[PDB]
Write an enzyme that holds these catalytic residues in place. Structure first.
Site, short mmCIF file in Angstrom:
data_model
loop_
_atom_site.label_atom_id
_atom_site.label_comp_id
_atom_site.label_asym_id
_atom_site.label_seq_id
_atom_site.Cartn_x
_atom_site.Cartn_y
_atom_site.Cartn_z
N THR A 268 0.82 -1.16 0.00
CA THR A 268 0.00 0.00 0.00
C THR A 268 0.89 1.26 0.00
OG1 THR A 268 -0.33 -0.38 2.45
CG2 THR A 268 -2.18 -0.94 1.02
N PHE A 393 -6.25 5.13 6.78
CA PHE A 393 -5.64 4.24 7.74
C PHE A 393 -6.63 3.51 8.66
CE2 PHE A 393 -2.14 7.18 6.51
CZ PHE A 393 -1.26 6.24 6.03
N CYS A 400 -4.54 1.42 11.35
CA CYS A 400 -3.19 1.05 10.88
C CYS A 400 -2.10 1.26 11.94
CB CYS A 400 -2.82 1.89 9.64
SG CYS A 400 -1.21 1.43 8.97
C1 HEM Z 1 0.05 3.98 2.65
C2 HEM Z 1 0.30 3.02 3.51
C3 HEM Z 1 -0.74 2.30 4.25
C4 HEM Z 1 -2.13 2.34 4.19
C5 HEM Z 1 -2.95 3.20 3.21
C6 HEM Z 1 -2.60 1.43 5.21
C7 HEM Z 1 -3.98 1.21 5.49
C8 HEM Z 1 -4.49 0.42 6.52
C9 HEM Z 1 -5.90 0.24 6.76
C10 HEM Z 1 -7.05 0.89 5.94
C11 HEM Z 1 -6.01 -0.60 7.83
C12 HEM Z 1 -7.35 -1.05 8.43
C13 HEM Z 1 -7.76 -2.46 7.97
C14 HEM Z 1 -9.19 -2.86 8.32
O1 HEM Z 1 -9.88 -2.20 9.13
O2 HEM Z 1 -9.72 -3.86 7.76
C15 HEM Z 1 -4.65 -0.95 8.22
C16 HEM Z 1 -4.32 -1.83 9.22
C17 HEM Z 1 -3.01 -2.30 9.38
N1 HEM Z 1 -1.86 -1.82 8.79
FE1 HEM Z 1 -1.70 -0.46 7.44
N2 HEM Z 1 -1.55 0.95 5.92
C18 HEM Z 1 -0.39 1.35 5.35
C19 HEM Z 1 0.91 1.05 5.74
C20 HEM Z 1 1.27 0.07 6.63
C21 HEM Z 1 2.60 -0.24 6.99
C22 HEM Z 1 3.89 0.42 6.44
C23 HEM Z 1 2.45 -1.29 7.88
C24 HEM Z 1 3.49 -2.02 8.64
C25 HEM Z 1 4.78 -1.66 8.69
C26 HEM Z 1 1.05 -1.59 8.07
C27 HEM Z 1 0.50 -2.54 8.93
C28 HEM Z 1 -0.86 -2.63 9.24
C29 HEM Z 1 -1.37 -3.59 10.23
C30 HEM Z 1 -0.56 -4.62 10.98
C31 HEM Z 1 -2.71 -3.39 10.31
C32 HEM Z 1 -3.65 -4.13 11.22
C33 HEM Z 1 -3.67 -3.39 12.54
C34 HEM Z 1 -4.50 -4.09 13.62
O3 HEM Z 1 -5.67 -4.34 13.38
O4 HEM Z 1 -4.01 -4.44 14.73
N3 HEM Z 1 0.37 -0.68 7.37
N4 HEM Z 1 -3.73 -0.29 7.43
#
Ligand code: HEM
Ligand code: HEM
Ligand SMILES: CCCCCCCCCCCCCCCC(=O)NCC(=O)O
Ligand SMILES: CCCCCCCCCCCCCCCC(=O)NCC(=O)O
Lengths: 457, 459
Positions: A268, A393, A400
C-alpha cells in the site's frame, strides 16, 4: 424516519454477486455509489452487506461502542495465508490484543529514529538506480516503488535484504504475493468456489502460499544464525511478552505476523508513492512547490530524521494522494447489537458494513465541489477537517499500526526524488488503476533528468 | 639436427578433426602436448598447424623479424562477427594500422588515470552487492566477475551503463556473445561445415550477431543523441584521424571495433578474476598474505590510483593465475620466410604455429618441478624470468592493447575484495573449466563474510 435502502441491479438467484465479476471491483462499486448515493444494499447468495459512502454515516460506523471490525470476504480469503496476524484477526481473538501489545513498541518514536538510517539505505539505492540510467531509458514507476518499499520493510522489520534493486524481474515473493491477492479478489465473484473449474487456481494459490512460507523460513533461520542484537520488529515477535497475559507469541502466530507485515508493510506504500508521483507530474505547479520545499529543507547529502519531519508540503501531497486513491480502499464493520444507522436504516446484530474509502473522500459536503482536483492545500489545517472524514488508515483500535512508518518512509523518498530529479510524463500517461484488493497505477512510466546533486553514505 | 614432429591419431581424410570431440578442446590439446612434447602437428580438412609448448621454441616464434600474427581458424570464425577489428585483422591490413594508431591513445598513462574513477564506480557496486547478501546466500563468482568487467569496459570505453548489477540474468549481449563464441569453437570440430544439417546453427549465429549489433546501435545513438561529449575510446573511434593516412575509421570498421572492445575488453578479465579468487580460496596462506597487503595499502574509504600501484602482491597473485590458466589460451603465428625452428624443424614461408600458452607456462625447465603449485612469489622480480616464458597477453606489435587496463582493473577490484571480506570455499568446489575459445571456471561459488569496513562514496 425509516427509509428503504437502494440496491444495484440483480442477476436472478445470484443477486448482486456478478457485479463483482471484474478485475476493477472497487472502481465498479464507486460508480454504483455515484448512482445510488451514501448507502446501498449489496446481496449475494447467503450474504448481505451495506456499502457506505458519506461522512454522515461513516462517522457512526466509526463508533466502537456500536460497531466492531469485521473480516470482509476479501480478508477471509487473505486469512488462508495471513491467519490470525494483526490484519486478519477478529478484535476478540486472543492473538489480536496479544500481538498488538507486543508489537506496538516497534512503532514508537524511538523505534522510528532507529529505522531512519535503514530507510535512507534503500532510498539511496533507488536514487542511484535512476542516476545510472542511460539517455534512452525510462522508469517503470510502481515496479521501482515496490522494490523500495518491500526492501524497506525487509531491512527495518527483519534485518533481511530482499535486494530488489539487484533483479530486473519482480522479486519472487512479490510475484507470489500479487498472484495470491489477485486470487483472493477473483474469488469474491465465485458463487461456487469448489467447482472443478477452479482446481487450477487452488493449486497455484497453494504454490504461492508455499513460496511466501519458504521466504519466512529464511528470515527466521537468518535471525537465529546471527542472534546479534537487532532490536527490531522481529526481535519483539521472537522475544516480547504481552504485559496483560504474560505470554509471548507462539510459533504459528509469529509466522503469520511476518507474512502480514511483509505484505501490509509494503504494498500500500508502493501504491501511495506511485499515485503521488502520478499526481505530481500531472500537476506541474504542485510538483514545483513540492521540489522547492525539498531543495530548501534537504540541505545535507542525505536526509536526517529531523529534516524529513520538516517536509510539510510533501506530507500534504501524500495526504491528497491518499484522499483520491487510498491504496487499501475499504474496511468492514459489524453491528454489535440491533441499531439504527443515521436515524433511517435499521440494522440487526451482526449486520455487515463496507466503508468505501475513495467515496468517503469525495463527499461534497466535506470537501466541496471540486473533489477530483489534486490540491494538497486541502490539508493546510488538519485540525479543521471534520471527524472521520479522512480515513485511509482505518479506524479506532483497529487502525493502521504502521501509519507513522509509511508516512515517514514515503515523505523521505518523495523528498529525495524531488531534490534529485526533474520528471517528464513522456508518454502522456493515462491512469489505469490495477486492483489486487489494493490499488496501484499500472503501466505508469516517466523519464527522470538528473539535477546532478551529489548523494551521501 | 633435423627431426620429424609427432602427430596424434588421424582419421583418414578428416585427419585430426575427430580427435577432439569435446567442449573442452584446449584442455584436450594440453593432454596431447603432455604426451607428445614441445611440438606436434595438427591437421584438419584444408589446414595444418603446429602446436608449440616450450619456451625454447616459443622464444623463436616470438621473433617478429621471422613470424607475424596469424589468424588461427578460431579467429577466422570470430572474424565472421568481429570483422577487421583489432583482434581479427592481419598486421598488413590497412584497417589494423589505422585503428591501432587511432585507439592506442586510449591506453595512454593520462587515459588510465582518467579511467580510475569509473573503475572505482563499478567496483564499489560489486562490493556493495556482496555486503548486502544475507547469511544463507552465496556468491556466483564468474557471474559477478562478468557483471563487473562488462560494466567497466562499457563505462570507461563508451560512457554506457550496462547496469549489470541491476539484473538477475545476464545482459542479452552476454548471452549472444557466449553463443557466438561457442559456435566458433564448435565449427572447428565440424566435418562438412556446409552440410545443410548446420543451417539451424547458422540461423542462431545470425540472430546472435544481430543482438550484438542492436547494442552497438544503442551505444552510438546514446553518444550522438547526447551532447555531453566525453574523451574516451568511442570519441576516438567516431572522430579520431590516423596520423599516417590522415583518414578516420569508416562506419563498418567502427562497428567491428565496438564489438571487439566489448568482448576482448571484459571476457578474459572476468576469467582472470574468477581463477584468481579460486586459487586464493584453495591456498589460505596466499589469501592471508594478499589480505594483509590490501589492509596495509588500501587505508582510505576508496582506493586512489597510486594505492592500486602499490599492491605488488595482488599483482603477483594475478600473474600466477595467468600462468596456470591464461584466459585467451592460444595465439597463432606464420613464417614470414623459410626458416628453421629450434635448429631442428624446417618451415616454409606461410607455415603456421600455435602457441599453447597454458603448456608454455608449465615448462619445467623454466619454472621448476612444482609447476602445478600456486605460488605468487615466482613473480617477486619479473625481470629475472626468461624472455618469452610468460605470454598471457600475446606478443610484440600484436600484443594485448588492453593489458594495463586489465591489470589495473583486476588489481583494484581484487584489492577491494580482500580488504572488505573473508572468503569461504563452502562447497569445496572442484575446478570445472568452461571453454568458449576463452577459459573460465563454471559453477564456482563462495561465501563472503564482511569485515564491516565502511566504503567511501564514488570519487
Ligand atoms: C500507505 C500506507 C498504508 C495504508 C494506506 C494502510 C492502510 C491500513 C488500513 C485501511 C487498515 C485497516 C484495515 C481494516 O480495518 O480492515 C490498516 C491496518 C493495518 N496496517 Fe496499514 N496501511 C499502510 C501502511 C502500513 C505499513 C507500512 C504497515 C506495517 C509496517 C502496516 C501494517 C498494518 C497492520 C498490521 C494493520 C492491522 C492493525 C491491527 O488491526 O491491529 N500498514 N492499514
Ligand atoms: C586478462 C585480460 C586479458 C588477456 C589475458 C588478454 C589477452 C590477449 C591476447 C593473448 C591477445 C593477442 C591475441 C593474438 O595474438 O591472437 C590480445 C589482444 C588484444 N587485446 Fe587483450 N587480453 C586481456 C584484456 C584486454 C582488455 C581489457 C582489452 C581492451 C580494453 C583488450 C583488448 C585487446 C585487443 C584490442 C587486442 C588486439 C590487439 C591488436 O592486435 O592490435 N584485452 N589480448
Ligand atoms: C496480510 C495483509 C494484507 C492486507 C490486505 C489489504 C487489503 C485491504 C483492502 C481490502 C479491500 C477489498 C475490497 C474489495 C471489494 C469488496 O467490496 N469486497 C467485499 C468483501 O470482500 O466482502
Ligand atoms: C572479437 C574479440 C575476440 C574474442 C575471442 C578471443 C579468443 C582468444 C583465444 C583463442 C583460442 C583458440 C583455441 C583453439 C583450440 C582448438 O580448439 N583447436 C582445434 C582446431 O583448431 O581444430
Amino acid at each position: 424516519t425509516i427509509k428503504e435502502m437502494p440496491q444495484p441491479k440483480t442477476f436472478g438467484e445470484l443477486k448482486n454477486l456478478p457485479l463483482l465479476n471484474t478485475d476493477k471491483p472497487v472502481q465498479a462499486l464507486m460508480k454504483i455509489a455515484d448512482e445510488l448515493g451514501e448507502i446501498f444494499k449489496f446481496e449475494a447468495p447467503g450474504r448481505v452487506t451495506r456499502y457506505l459512502s458519506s461522512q454522515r454515516l461513516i462517522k457512526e460506523a466509526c463508533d466502537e461502542s456500536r460497531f466492531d471490525k469485521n473480516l470482509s470476504q476479501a480478508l477471509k480469503f487473505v486469512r488462508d495465508f495471513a491467519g490470525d496476524g494483526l490484519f486478519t484477526s477478529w478484535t476478540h481473538e486472543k492473538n489480536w490484543k496479544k500481538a498488538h501489545n507486543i508489537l506496538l513498541p516497534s512503532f514508537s518514536q524511538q523505534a522510528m529514529k532507529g529505522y531512519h538510517a535503514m530507510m535512507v539505505d534503500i532510498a539511496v539505492q533507488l536514487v542511484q538506480k535512476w542516476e545510472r540510467l542511460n539517455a534512452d531509458e525510462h522508469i517503470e514507476v510502481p515496479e521501482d516503488m515496490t522494490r523500495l518499499t518491500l526492501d524497506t520493510i525487509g531491512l527495518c522489520g527483519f534485518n533481511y535484504r530482499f535486494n530488489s534493486f539487484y533483479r530486473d524481474q519482480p522479486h519472487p515473493f512479490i510475484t507470489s504475493m500479487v498472484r495470491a491477492l489477485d486470487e483472493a479478489m477473483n474469488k469474491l465473484q465465485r458463487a461456487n468456489p469448489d467447482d472443478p473449474a477452479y482446481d487450477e487456481n487452488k493449486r497455484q494459490f497453494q504454490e504461492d502460499i508455499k513460496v511466501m512460507n519458504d521466504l519466512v523460513d529464511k528470515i527466521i533461520a537468518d535471525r537465529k544464525a546471527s542472534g546479534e542484537q537487532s532490536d527490531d520488529l522481529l526481535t519483539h515477535m521472537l522475544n516480547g511478552k504481552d504485559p496483560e497475559t504474560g505470554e509471548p507469541l507462539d510459533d504459528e502466530n509469529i509466522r503469520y505476523q511476518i507474512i502480514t507485515f511483509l505484505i501490509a508493510g509494503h504494498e500500500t506504500t508502493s501504491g501511495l508513492l506511485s499515485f503521488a508521483l502520478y499526481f505530481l507530474v500531472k500537476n506541474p505547479h504542485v510538483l514545483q512547490k513540492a521540489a522547492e520545499e525539498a531543495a530548501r529543507v534537504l540541505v545535507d547529502p542525505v536526509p536526517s530524521y529531523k529534516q524529513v519531519k520538516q517536509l510539510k508540503y510533501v506530507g500534504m501531497v501524500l495526504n491528497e494522494a491518499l484522499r483520491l486513491w487510498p491504496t487499501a480502499p475499504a474496511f468492514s464493520l459489524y453491528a454489535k447489537e440491533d441499531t439504527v444507522l443515521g436515524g433511517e436504516y435499521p440494522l440487526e446484530k451482526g449486520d455487515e458494513l463496507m466503508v468505501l474509502i475513495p467515496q468517503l473522500h469525495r463527499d461534497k459536503t466535506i470537501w466541496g465541489d471540486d473533489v477530483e482536483e489534486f490540491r494538497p492545500e486541502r490539508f493546510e489545517n488538519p485540525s479543521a477537517i471534520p471527524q472521520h472524514a479522512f480515513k485511509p488508515f482505518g479506524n479506532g483500535q483497529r487502525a493502521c499500526i504502521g501509519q507513522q512508518f509509511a508516512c515517514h518512509e514515503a515523505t523521505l523518498v518523495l523528498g529525495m526524488m524531488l531534490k534529485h530529479f526533474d520528471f517528464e510524463d513522456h508518454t502522456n500517461y493515462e491512469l489505469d488503476i490495477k486492483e489486487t484488493l489494493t490499488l496501484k497505477p499500472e503501466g505508469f512510466v516517466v523519464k527522470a533528468k538528473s539535477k546532478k546533486i551529489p548523494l551521501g553514505g
